[PDB]
């Protein structure tokens, strides 16, 4: 799932 500040 799109996670902030992790590529």
């Amino acid at each position: 799932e799109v996670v902030p500040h992790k590529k």
Epitope: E1, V2, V3, P4, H5, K6, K7
Partner: antibody
Framework: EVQLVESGGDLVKPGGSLKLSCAAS????????MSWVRQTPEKRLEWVAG????????FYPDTVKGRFIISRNNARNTLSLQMSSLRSEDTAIYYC????????????WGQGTTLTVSS | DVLMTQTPLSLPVSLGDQASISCRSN???????????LEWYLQKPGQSPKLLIY???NRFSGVPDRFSGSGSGTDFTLKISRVEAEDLGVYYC?????????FGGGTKLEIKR
């Protein structure tokens, strides 16, 4: 085209609690991480909560940790911020912000809601 | 945290000149995949902040080719060349490379006259 519109800031007292909200429209909210950035009355910008596309992951700065909860209804596309034990330092324009596809910077920002914390 | 100092605090410039605002981090913004995430945002008079330059040189769509960004590692810089009056506002530089993502102090670009 992306629109993020927020509502909720009212005069709160210290010790209080409020819950601000933000509506998104114009893009598939569920694939975009989202964030709430705030502008202090001295104009310096502080980031206060950030959230993953599914609501699983939640990140907070040390100053709001414990007192602010962020969450998101990925079905009636709203993103929120429930605010507990407020202090006067928390006065500011709260901005609902949309994280990039490449999630380390924000590309669109809401219009803002002033929260005032005072007695 | 990672302090982002920004200089100068207010910058008088006259329509047709060049303005350099510049920003600096006490820690590197370079992640091991070679991406340096320093972005530049614009808060015009009345409105909310816009992305102008993102990931050090790239320009978000819609920003004139007079906003150009350069720098690497720890000193970064914006060049507004041929300043026009509808450029007045406060310029903030930012870093998403480390959590928490910090922001610089702000630079008021003032139109000289």
């Amino acid at each position: 085209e992306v629109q993020l519109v927020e509502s909720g800031g009212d005069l709160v007292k210290p010790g209080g609690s409020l819950k601000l909200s933000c509506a998104a429209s114009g893009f598939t909210f569920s694939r975009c991480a989202m964030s709430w950035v705030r502008q202090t009355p001295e104009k310096r910008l502080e980031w206060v909560a950030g959230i993953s596309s599914g609501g699983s992951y939640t990140f907070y700065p040390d100053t709001v940790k414990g007192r602010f909860i962020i969450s998101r209804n990925n079905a009636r596309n709203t993103l929120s911020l429930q605010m507990s034990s407020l202090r006067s330092e928390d006065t500011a324009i709260y901005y609902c912000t949309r994280y990039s596809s490449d999630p380390f910077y924000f590309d669109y920002w809401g219009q803002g809601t002033t929260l005032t914390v005072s007695s | 945290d990672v302090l982002m100092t920004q200089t100068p605090l207010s910058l008088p410039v006259s329509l047709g000149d060049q303005a350099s605002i510049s920003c600096r981090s006490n820690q590197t913004i370079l992640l091991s995949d070679g991406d340096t995430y320093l972005e530049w945002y614009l808060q015009k008079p009345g409105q909310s902040p816009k992305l102008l330059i993102y990931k050090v040189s790239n320009r978000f769509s819609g920003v004139p080719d007079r906003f150009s960004g350069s720098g690497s590692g720890t000193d970064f810089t914006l060049k507004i060349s041929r300043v026009e009056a509808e450029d007045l506002g406060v310029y903030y530089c930012f870093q998403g490379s480390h959590v928490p993502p910090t922001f610089g102090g702000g630079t008021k670009l003032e139109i000289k006259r």
